Structure formats: structure tokens, C-alpha cells
């Protein structure tokens with residue numbers, strides 16, 4: 001339905017995020033969920049901690065070690081939506097598997113407000129977008145996300161969420177999601193997430209898509225600049241991000257009238 005897709009894109013452009021229900025069917029959800037659980041339990045994950053406590057555990061670059069996650073990262077429907085929303089051809093940058101849950105003596109805490117762009121070591125960071133796919137039901141209390149609509153159109157912080165003049169006065173929209181729903185959000189959209197205050201883990205994936213012309217651009221933060229699976233040598237500033245490691249979401253056409 002091209003009309004509903006136009007409306008959806010227009011919402012994305014105006015707000016800086018959009019909710020898309022039922023992007024995965026029930027079987028797909030049950031497949032990706034199992035693989036998410038398997039990876040978290042049997043492979044390496046990374047703790048995102050703060051003084052406040054545990055923000056989350058995640059499997060980094062999950063697509064590199066798991067085909068099943070790569071299929072999700074390049075899912076045809078998700079990819080097609082992303083490209084339509086972005087308005088250009090895209091490449092995959094990374095997929096992560098995200099877990100928020102309460103453990104013994106380790107309570108889940110919120111994800112503090114931020115925007116994603118400044119942590120992206122590539123040239124088109126400012127127009128990147130993220131697909132966050134719910135693999136279980138994520139009501140408010142299980143730590144769904146909140147977005148500040150229009151915040152992607154604000155100028156740069158002079159550093160920085162909620163630092164620009166008037167920004168604190170801007171309304172915020174909390175978006176609970178059913179299993180198999182996703183959101184897309186722009187790299188400049190301010191977003192946060194609640195603590196998981198339930199007994200059921202919050203499980204999802206988050207995939208970052210970038211302009212197909214993206215080039216390497218170090219942030220100067222070692223941890224963000226070091227891209228696994230890109231060869232022995234560090235990457236040079238300006239180096240294009242291409243190939244299997246940063247795949248095009250849509251096969252480029254050889255066939256033309």
C-alpha cells in the first residue's frame with residue numbers, strides 16, 4: 001500500500017521515529033528469540049553498566065557470529081522499510097542483541113537519554129537509523145523506549161541530550177511494543193528506555209543502518225572506533241565501508257531497460 005507507506009515515512013521525518021507493528025510474523029519471532037537466548041546464554045556478551053547499575057547486557061556485532069542474526073539484520077521487510085524511510089540505499093553497520101533483566105543483587109536500571117549519532121564512527125552518522133525489534137512483549141514496565149519527537153531536527157549540542165534551549169519543554173512519547181513490532185529511529189532523535197521492573201526479561205535486537213556511501217570516520221573513542229571483522233590493520237579515515245562486512249540491504253541492479 002504506497003499511501004500508508006508514504007504516511008509512515010512522513011511520520012518518521014516529522015518525529016524522528018516510527019512504530020511499525022508486526023514486522024516479524026509469529027514463527028520468525030520464535031526463531032529469532034531462541035537464537036537471542038542461545039547467544040546470551042552460550043556466547044560472549046557485554047555488560048553496559050553505570051554507577052546506577054546495569055543498563056543492559058548485549059551481544060556485540062551479533063551478525064558476525066550468527067547467520068540467524070544476520071538474516072534478521074538483513075530481513076527483507078525491515079530492510080525495505082529502512083530504505084524507504086531513509087530515502088536512500090543503505091548498508092548494515094551492526095546488529096546487537098539486547099537484554100534487560102533483573103538478576104539477583106543486580107537490578108535492571110533505565111537507559112539514560114541520548115542520541116546515537118555521536119557514537120557512530122562513519123561519515124553519515126548524522127542520517128543513520130536504528131531498527132529496534134521486540135522479540136517479546138515490551139510494555140512500559142518491561143523497559144520500552146521513549147522518544148522526543150522532532151529532537152532530530154534540533155541543532156548540535158555545543159558539546160548532550162536535553163542541553164539545547166527549550167529541549168527539556170519538548171514532549172516525550174513512550175512506545176510500548178508487542179512481540180514482532182519494531183521501531184525505527186533517526187540517529188539524532190533523543191531516546192531513552194525504562195528499567196525492566198518485571199520478572200520477564202526484555203529481549204530485542206537493535207540494528208544500525210547507514211548510507212551506502214558511508215565512510216570510516218573515527219570518533220576518537222577507542223572502544224567505538226575499533227570495528228571487529230574488518231581485517232588486521234586499523235581502518236583509515238575516509239575508507240569506504242563496503243563488502244560482506246557492511247552489506248548493501250538491497251542487491252544493486254545489473255538489469256536496466
Ligand SMILES: O=C(O)CCC(=O)C(=O)O
Nearest residue numbers: 098111116130132193206
Ligand atoms: O534498548 C534500549 O534500552 C536502548 C536502545 C538504544 O539506545 C538504541 O537502540 O539506539
Ligand SMILES: [Fe+3]
Nearest residue numbers: 114115116191
Ligand atoms: Fe540509542
